[PDB]
Design an enzyme around this catalytic site. Structure first.
Site, PDB file in Angstrom:
ATOM      1  N   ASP A   8       0.938  -1.097   0.049  1.00 45.41           N
ATOM      2  CA  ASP A   8       0.037   0.114  -0.060  1.00 45.41           C
ATOM      3  C   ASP A   8       0.940   1.157   0.229  1.00 45.41           C
ATOM      4  OD1 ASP A   8      -3.133  -0.163   1.771  1.00 45.41           O
ATOM      5  OD2 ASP A   8      -2.335  -1.628   0.160  1.00 45.41           O
ATOM      6  N   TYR A  10       0.166   5.293   0.991  1.00 43.75           N
ATOM      7  CA  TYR A  10      -0.139   6.049   2.364  1.00 43.75           C
ATOM      8  C   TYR A  10      -0.184   5.369   3.625  1.00 43.75           C
ATOM      9  CZ  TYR A  10      -1.161   8.846  -1.950  1.00 43.75           C
ATOM     10  OH  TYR A  10      -1.003   9.533  -3.238  1.00 43.75           O
ATOM     11  N   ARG A  39      -7.767  12.680   6.049  1.00 45.30           N
ATOM     12  CA  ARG A  39      -7.648  11.316   5.929  1.00 45.30           C
ATOM     13  C   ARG A  39      -9.029  10.575   5.926  1.00 45.30           C
ATOM     14  NH1 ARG A  39      -4.811   6.018   5.510  1.00 45.30           N
ATOM     15  NH2 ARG A  39      -4.165   5.904   3.554  1.00 45.30           N
ATOM     16  N   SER A 116      -1.990   1.248  -5.232  1.00 47.01           N
ATOM     17  CA  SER A 116      -2.343   2.172  -4.505  1.00 47.01           C
ATOM     18  C   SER A 116      -3.523   2.972  -5.062  1.00 47.01           C
ATOM     19  CB  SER A 116      -1.153   3.350  -4.294  1.00 47.01           C
ATOM     20  OG  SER A 116      -1.664   4.419  -3.469  1.00 47.01           O
TER      21      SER A 116
END
Lengths: 220, 220
Positions: A8, A10, A39, A116
């Site tokens: 992944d 982030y 987020r 991602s």
């Protein structure tokens, strides 16, 4: 068994907390509140837009999520402050172990890829910025399938780009909600737990729980 | 134009904050923290499980969301404390205006329905508990379609059960994320904004923004 690894971006390899600084120097004291809400808004927008079948690229979702966060906190967000603050993600910093862990991983001849949600524009930006481009074989974006994780159409891309069966692909993620979907899909899963969080209660359990990428390198 | 109305349940007609009390008398001082994390976990589980195509009824999701919340806060949640606390939702209280607003609404001969994510077991429980059963024509659950909102397969049920076109069905909701999906689907939308929140940034705007059901009754 494993011949490849799907990471992944982030939160797993790059620290989201890198944004807090630039957020705070624009709205002093409020910098940590703007990011925590940013987020959560990003994630919620990607999930909801997918279910509503109303897709827009990640760059769009990140801009909309900020516009809401600021408006929700009463903060005044002009045009320029929106650009440089959104530009912050294109310059995240990798966790200390990442650079060396990735190096020793590739040295073992495993295929490394990034699956991602960010646009291929963003992915290459943060990876190249950290000088980590020369370490990954493929930089997979969800943009092509026009849907976000944990939708299975996303997990397939990784299985198709790597040219390996999901059983030979280790799925590495810090986000326990993504590691739940991947495990359902069929990937052996490794949950990166640096903050001592507890797993989601969605019926799944990762195959491995570790505190850093250092442990991933030792699984080999 | 409108001949029917599709209401949300939790947060629109019944107060979720009714759970805080019973949550606090089990984990003193922590009662407000356990609920805020409970509702966010519920929503996130319904959305994610839908995308993962791994459905489980709302009663299941509400139990799993609590099990996580307590484990995340270090709180010890035994078997009995889990049941009575989950039983709390089956006894929510309607906002003060609701009872009278619904009465005057039906008096105008409009069809009233509840399109909720809760199991038909839960829906009838909270509505009958408040003695509001004799006010609704249909109590629609998402259980049949085996998927949660904002998936369009959910919004159709309302159009099929009411026997009216979506254009003749007013969609009333407090949750701005649900009012976004409904508007995309085609329903005229009324957002109930009691807490002065700002709308989501997912590309949509409700047709009407009001502070209570009192304003809905005056639209007629």
């Amino acid at each position: 068994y494993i011949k490849g690894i799907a990471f992944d971006l982030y939160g797993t390899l790059f620290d989201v907390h890198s944004v807090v600084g630039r957020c705070d120097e624009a709205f002093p004291g409020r910098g940590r509140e703007i990011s925590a809400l940013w987020r959560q808004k990003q994630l919620e927008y990607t999930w909801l837009r997918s279910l509503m079948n109303r897709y827009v690229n990640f760059q769009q979702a990140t801009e909309d999520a900020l516009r809401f966060t600021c408006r929700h906190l009463g903060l005044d967000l002009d045009a320029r402050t929106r650009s440089t603050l959104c530009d912050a993600y294109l310059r995240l910093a990798p966790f200390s172990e990442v650079p060396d862990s990735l190096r020793e991983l590739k040295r073992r001849g495993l295929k490394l890829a990034i699956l991602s949600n960010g646009s291929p524009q963003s992915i290459d930006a943060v990876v190249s910025h950290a000088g980590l481009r020369d370490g990954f074989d493929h930089l997979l974006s969800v943009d092509p399938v026009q849907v976000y994780k944990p939708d299975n159409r996303v997990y397939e891309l990784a299985e198709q780009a790597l040219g390996l069966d999901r059983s030979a692909i280790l799925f590495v993620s810090s986000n326990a909600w993504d590691a739940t979907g991947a495990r359902y899909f069929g990937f052996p899963t490794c949950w990166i737990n640096r903050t001592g969080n507890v797993f989601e209660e969605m019926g799944q359990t990762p195959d491995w729980e570790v505190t850093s990428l250092r442990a991933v390198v030792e699984l080999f």
